[model samples]
Target: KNFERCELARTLKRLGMDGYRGISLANWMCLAKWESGYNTRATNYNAGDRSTDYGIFQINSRYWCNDGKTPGAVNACHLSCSALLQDNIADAVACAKRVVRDPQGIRAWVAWRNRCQNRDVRQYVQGCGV
Candidate 1:
């Protein structure tokens, strides 16, 4: 599913993404915008490591989900990578939570660091009224 900006924000809010592990909803909005343009089925393959980033948040196969093709990957989220591509985001959200539980926190996504780290990210969720 390709989500409208505000629609995604409120959905994330409903799922308790507001302050999960100190990351704000607006930050999540920004990440989704840059990482996958709010498209649930988006993917980007890494030729270097043969891993792929899957779904709305672009969770990768390297250590997050199992694509069964990454060179030496592990599934910390314990679900198939396809789970992240479904229109329903419950699995993706749960996996995202697990990703942030690691030491890097939201820094697991370099897109967030380059684009959302210190920006006025409220604009991503401003009119959503979330």
Candidate 2:
């Protein structure tokens, strides 16, 4: 399920991600754009490491979820990596909140670190009223 940008913004707001734990909605929306473009089933394979990122948040297999292929994965979210690909996104949102609790906050996403950090992302949610 691909989300319209406004739909995603609304959902994110509904999930209480606007300023969630001090991570702004703009940051989250920008991160999602760079990570998965709001595609619920988005998946990116890293052949070099034999790992993958799943869903809109691009939850990684290395530390967050078990892909069943990555060895020694922590599966810290305690769910299958594929669970992140579902349209409902409850699991993905929950796991993402868990990830934000880590030391890096939302900077755990490489996209956020490289592209969204210190960037003004108000446009991502502009007019969405989220």
Candidate 3:
């Protein structure tokens, strides 16, 4: 399912992502928009390397999740990739937090790296009353 922009913002705030990893809620929202359009069931398959990015946060199977069918999977989050496709994002949020805490920080997300970084994203939450 896809979340409304305001719903995603509020959910992130309640999960304490507003300022987590030194990233603003706006940045997170912006990243999600670019990556998955706020849809929990989102997935991106890279055919060349056979890697898949799953869910709203687009957690990668090669690093963060396991597809069971994929080889050389790291499964860093110790969860199935399908788990991230649920409407309840608690697991996805927790895993994303762990990812950002890594030395690479939020740079783990290329969408954030290319689009949200250093941008004035205040408008993302301006009317959400967050």
Candidate 4:
């Protein structure tokens, strides 16, 4: 099940992407479409031991959970699926806007995906249309 779309906006806002007049939401939609096909349950096929990488944003809760810190460590807690539920599309949209505006933001994100992509999907991820 997909969390509400606004959840992504909130996460982006936390990372400094602030949405205004729906621009943030629009940008996020574009990124997520390519990032994870908007699937809350999407995952990378080649993640070593097959760990979970959850939510609509496809952010790995194990690595990016913000319970007490940025969710990027092995001990990171699993983010509730509800964590993806949000009403603040502006924040998410804004975050995405800021990130994409960065000279290498989208490129970096695309690169990360490629690095962790399932071997079968590696080629597809390579052409993520930065």
Candidate 4: regions farther than 4 A off? 2-23, 49-51, 66-108, 111-130
Per-residue CA lDDT of model 4 for 1-130, tens digit only, reads: 3433455444444555434333333454455656666565555533564444434444443444433332344422334423543433333333334444545554436633554333232232232332
Worst 10 residues of 2 by lDDT: 67-76
Off by over 4 Å in 2: none
> Candidate order by lDDT, highest to lowest?
1, 2, 3, 4
Q: Between the candidate structures 1 and 4, which one is better when assessed by TM-score?
A: 1
What CA root-mean-square deviation does each model show from the true structure?
Answer: 0.7, 1.0, 1.0, 9.7
Least accurate 10 contiguous residues by lDDT in model 1: 121-130
Query: Quick one: RMSD of model 3?
Result: 1.0
TM-score, cand. 2 vs. native: 0.95
lDDT of 3: 0.89
lDDT of 1 by residue, 2-95 (tens): 9999989989999889999999999999999999999999999989778899999999999999989998899999999999999999899999
Cand. 2 Cα-lDDT: 0.89
Q: Compute the lDDT of residue 109 as modeled in candidate 2.
A: 86
- Best by TM-score, which number? 1
Looking at model 1, the pairs that clash are none
lDDT of 3 at 16: 89
lDDT of 4 at 14: 58
lDDT of 2 by residue, 1-130 (tens): 9898988999988988888879888888898899998898999999988889999999999999997899777899999988999998889988999999989899788889899998888899999987
RMSD of 1: 0.7
